[PDB]
């Protein structure tokens, strides 16, 4: 499994290393993202009428 470097407050790596989570290997589907984001942005809305 691939691993990522942890950086300290000084900007330099501290030698700590942790495994990459498996969610970073998920498929990248912009069609699904756009379909969900369209509906998600509507759920904040507030009604108007005459």
């Amino acid at each position: 499994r691939p691993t990522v470097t942890v950086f300290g407050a000084d900007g330099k790596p501290t030698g700590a290393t942790e495994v990459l989570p498996k969610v970073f290997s998920a498929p990248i589907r912009p069609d699904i993202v756009k379909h969900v984001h369209t509906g998600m942005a509507k759920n904040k809305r507030q009604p108007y009428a005459v």
Binding site: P27, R29, P30, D31
Partner: protein, 129 residues
């Protein structure tokens, strides 16, 4: 159709891969697979594990199962034979039961790399009705 109606970027890569294979290779298997990728979902019916288990009952064992559809699971099948299946998608129960029986699961780009002519492949569809 020149362009698939699907917006799946990975299906677009599969169409590009099998356009090259259908053009540069004289195998009619690649032309059929490319045609089925262009069809819609109601024209790509599911294929259960019990239907493909019917088709390996005779001497069709040790042949790659290719389904241009998603492979479901059948609760009516008590035992699943060892088999090598390539498909667009697998359900979680279908993938687990194939791997529990000792078989392997492939994607269509793995099938293209392994068998670019479709040699020794048993190609199936689901029930249209």
């Amino acid at each position: 159709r020149k362009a698939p109606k699907s917006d799946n970027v990975y299906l677009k890569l599969l169409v590009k891969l099998y356009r090259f294979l259908a053009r540069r290779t004289e195998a009619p298997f690649n032309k059929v697979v490319l045609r089925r990728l262009f069809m819609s979902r109601i024209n790509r019916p599911p294929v259960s594990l019990s239907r493909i288990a019917r088709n390996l009952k005779n001497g069709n064992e040790k042949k790659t199962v290719v389904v241009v559809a998603t492979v479901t699971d059948d609760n009516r099948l008590l035992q699943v034979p060892k088999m090598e299946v390539a498909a667009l998608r697998f359900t979680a129960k279908a993938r687990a039961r194939i791997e529990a029986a000792g078989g392997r699961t492939l994607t269509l780009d793995q099938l293209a790399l392994e068998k670019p002519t479709g040699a020794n492949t048993l190609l199936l569809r689901g029930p249209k009705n």
